[PDB]
Structures are given as structure tokens and as C-alpha cells.
Ligand binder design. Structure first.
Ligand SMILES: [Ca+2]
Ligand SMILES: [Ca+2]
Ligand SMILES: [Zn+2]
Ligand SMILES: [Zn+2]
Length: 157
């Protein structure tokens, strides 16, 4: 399952109060760019309207049948490429979201979710961004690990 288009739109529907709106937007923009520099995909932000990828912070039951679980545990989930709910990413509004080394770092988690929104599943490689469990890595000048590059390149090009 892959996107049949290269320029995709995204919309941040709501925010987490833990960070400024500028910080949430920055975390998201930077997360999309990591995949962009390794594939033919281009991401355009819209403020209202129907975007391909909807992004939102939700708590527990939130209408899609996969409830979140409060602090820790499940951090976020994302739908595979598709119309409607397809490609959308939900973040557990009950987590502590940061832009530091403290758990958790929104940019790293968003980056992981977007891999899913683009059609990638988990990697068994512990150094991959797509590894199932969260681990902090310096974000300052972060680049996609080689395993993940192999991943989107195998899907798109
Ligand atoms: Ca949780
Ligand atoms: Ca969608
Ligand atoms: Zn959800
Ligand atoms: Zn995942």
C-alpha cells in the first residue's frame, strides 16, 4: 500500500498544550522533511480543509476503534496510505510531549508515525527509526538511518 501521488498535504487538527504551537508545527515539519530528502515525496501544510494526512492529539477512545491507554504504553498510531482515515496519525494526548531528551520527543515519534502513514511497517533493526520501541537519539541534525532509507526507497524511489 503506497500513495499514488507525490505531493501530499497534511493538517495539524489540534495541539498538545505541553509545547507552544510553533514547537508542535516545527516538530511535524521536520519529521516530514526526513522522509522527503530520501524519497520523491513532497509535503504541503494546509490550515483547514481536507488534507491527505490528518494529525491529531487524542485521549483514550477517539472514534477509530483503537483507543489510547493513558501515560506511557502506546504513544501513537498511524493508518496505512489510503483515502479517508488512511495515512492519518494520532498521538496520545496523555503523554508528556517534549522537544528535549526527556520522554518523549515529539519529533522522533512523529517521524516514526509518518513512516507508517507512508506505508512502512516496523523494522527488526534496533538502530532503525521504524524499530517498534521508542529510543531517544540526538535530534539537532538528525538524519534518517540507512535501514529506513532502504525502506521508503523500496516503496517509492
Ligand atoms: Ca499511552
Ligand atoms: Ca487521510
Ligand atoms: Zn486513533
Ligand atoms: Zn510504530
Amino acid at each position: 500500500p503506497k500513495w499514488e501521488r507525490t505531493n501530499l498535504t497534511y493538517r495539524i487538527r489540534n495541539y498538545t498544550p505541553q509545547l507552544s504551537e510553533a514547537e508542535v508545527e516545527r516538530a511535524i515539519k521536520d519529521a516530514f522533511e526526513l522522509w522527503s530528502v530520501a524519497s520523491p515525496l513532497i509535503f504541503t501544510r494546509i490550515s483547514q480543509g481536507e488534507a491527505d494526512i490528518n494529525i491529531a492529539f487524542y485521549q483514550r477512545d477517539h472514534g477509530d476503534n483503537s483507543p489510547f491507554d493513558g501515560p506511557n504504553g502506546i504513544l501513537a498510531h498511524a493508518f496505512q496510505p489510503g483515502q479517508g482515515i488512511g495515512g492519518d496519525a494520532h498521538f496520545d494526548a496523555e503523554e508528556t510531549w517534549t522537544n528535549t531528551s526527556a520522554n518523549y520527543n515529539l519529533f522522533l515519534v512523529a517521524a516514526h508515525e509518518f513512516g507508517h502513514s507512508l506505508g512502512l511497517a516496523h523494522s527488526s533493526d534496533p538502530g532503525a527509526l521504524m524499530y517498534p520501541n521508542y529510543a531517544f537519539r540526538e535530534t539537532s541534525n538528525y538524519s534518517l538511518p540507512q535501514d529506513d532509507i532502504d525502506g521508503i526507497q523500496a516503496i517509492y524511489g
